Amino acid sequence: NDYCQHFVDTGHRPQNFIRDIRLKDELIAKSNTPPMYLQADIEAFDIRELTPKFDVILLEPPLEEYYRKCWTWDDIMKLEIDEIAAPRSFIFLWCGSGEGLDLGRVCLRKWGYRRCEDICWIKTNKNNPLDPKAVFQRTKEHCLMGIKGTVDIDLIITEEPEIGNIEKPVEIFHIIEHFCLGRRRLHLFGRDSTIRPGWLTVGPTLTNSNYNAETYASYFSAPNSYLTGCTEEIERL
């Protein structure tokens, strides 16, 4: 059965027809720092104030293409991500499906990472059967994984969200957390709706803030400076 032909015939995307650990999530949840968040206009904001250096950065700038303030790849590329990333650390960069697939890789290289996974968010249209340069209908987005220093699959499948909904699948958080990469986790351009235990969310649309660098850093003082996020908390007194 040719699902490409079927989509030409009927409009049902080929991905519509793809068919179809607990203890770990529990250790992740016990290990999680309280959610912390900070309203900041990131164009105007000195990210160096975000300390300590992060083990994981999730970067979700609002691209023009999500809306059919927007950030161009010009703005993104000028972010000083490398000044807040721990010497060994990871980045997850949402790149969309256009030129971001190329310009996001330049970014990763500019900030000192190499790509090790290309995670694809494939969008079904079961409930509802173009860029000028596009050759094809674009039905997916890419989240690039980068590493600097020395169970899950690289696909997320969900239904296409309603128009004007720019939220990315919460599954990206489970994939990141299941890598057990460290507990300093930063979400740049997160939102009220994305705040989440074990994460520091920084974005311009947050309506409240509770971030305090000293308080935040106290979650990772000894004996907890090197925990992976997937181990039992270290016993005290």
Binding site: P14, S97, K133, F136
Partner: protein, 200 residues
């Protein structure tokens, strides 16, 4: 011609200028990713892709670090990457098969020049199709390529015998001999290769 045509060769040494111009180029190169016969990064860069097209599309399979290197070659060869096809690899029951398990392979889409009269936007950028033998890419890509550019000349690089299709010329070192029917090509091949085959 129109039926399948092919040329067993080493694509490094074939004077591909004898083949003329194609509306679409597809390639599945044996990138030297860190087992069974590869091309070095420099050999890949030096491939004489630029003579194959004036205006049209390149389809370039990539995996691993070829995702970045293939973008280099793609740009060096004179293309702009305008799309990226994802083949979701399934079994016969439509279930998906370092840090993450890989459920897919990638096919970069480059444009060169200004193509006109292609039916852009008929297919979507996701393929869902059954894994066959190792490295055997899905046949759906030929239907997508045919709807996009019906009846035009097309050329596949690093094809195996099962890759040969109508309107395509397949080059690869595991093809059986030389099978050419387009008289223009037959004439240019006999001029350049009177005694049959050469190197460097």
């Amino acid at each position: 011609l129109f039926p399948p045509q092919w040329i067993c060769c080493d694509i490094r040494y074939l004077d591909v200028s004898i083949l003329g111009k194609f509306a679409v180029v597809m390639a599945d190169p044996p990138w030297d990713i860190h087992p069974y016969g590869t091309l070095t990064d420099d050999e890949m860069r030096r491939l004489n892709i630029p003579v194959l097209q004036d205006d049209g599309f390149l389809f370039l399979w990539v995996t691993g670090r070829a995702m970045e290197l293939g973008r280099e070659c793609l740009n060096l060869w004179g293309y702009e990457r305008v799309d990226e096809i994802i083949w979701v690899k399934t079994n016969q029951l439509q279930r998906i098969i370092h840090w993450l398990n890989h459920g897919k392979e990638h096919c970069l889409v480059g444009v060169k020049g200004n193509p006109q009269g292609f039916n852009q936007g008929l297919d979507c950028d996701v393929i869902v199709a059954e894994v066959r033998s190792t490295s055997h890419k899905p046949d759906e890509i030929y239907g997508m390529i045919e709807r996009l550019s019906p009846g035009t000349r097309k050329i596949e690089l690093f094809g195996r015998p099962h890759n040969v299709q109508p309107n395509w010329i397949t080059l690869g070192n595991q093809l059986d001999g030389i099978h050419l029917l387009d008289p223009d090509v037959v004439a240019r091949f006999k001029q350049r290769y009177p005694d049959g085959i050469i190197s460097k």
